[PDB]
């Protein structure tokens, strides 16, 4: 009976639509590619650099 309140309700339904269609796909997509992140490459490079530095000559 309050048209602007019903418009707020419509806005809430659109927000629910967006979140329902957004959160699951993003979550699964970023879970699938966990091992392809830049942090993994940085960690591997750091480990290799440490290994090379410890074993070397003057």
């Amino acid at each position: 009976y309050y048209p602007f309140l019903w418009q707020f309700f419509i806005l809430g339904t659109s927000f629910v639509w967006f979140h329902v269609c957004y959160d699951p796909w993003l979550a699964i997509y970023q879970a699938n590619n966990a091992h392809r992140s830049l942090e993994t490459a940085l960690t591997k490079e750091k480990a290799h650099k440490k290994k090379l530095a410890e074993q070397e000559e003057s």
Binding site: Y2, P3, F4, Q7, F8, L11, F15
Partner: protein, 58 residues
């Protein structure tokens, strides 16, 4: 008998209509906040809450 001037009737009717239409101001504000939220965040933490002065040692 109650014989109000038509000026007053027009003024009161337009006051009620303005009251009715003002209710959608919050609605459009919420729509433009959900939309363009990054812009609002930049505004809030650049003008109203300026960043700290110091810089990292590195």
């Amino acid at each position: 008998m109650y014989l109000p001037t038509f000026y007053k009737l027009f003024h009161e009717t337009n006051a009620f209509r303005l009251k009715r239409y003002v209710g959608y101001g919050p609605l459009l504000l919420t729509w433009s906040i959900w939309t363009l939220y990054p812009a609002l965040y930049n505004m809030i933490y650049s003008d109203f809450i300026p960043p700290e002065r110091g810089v990292p040692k590195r």
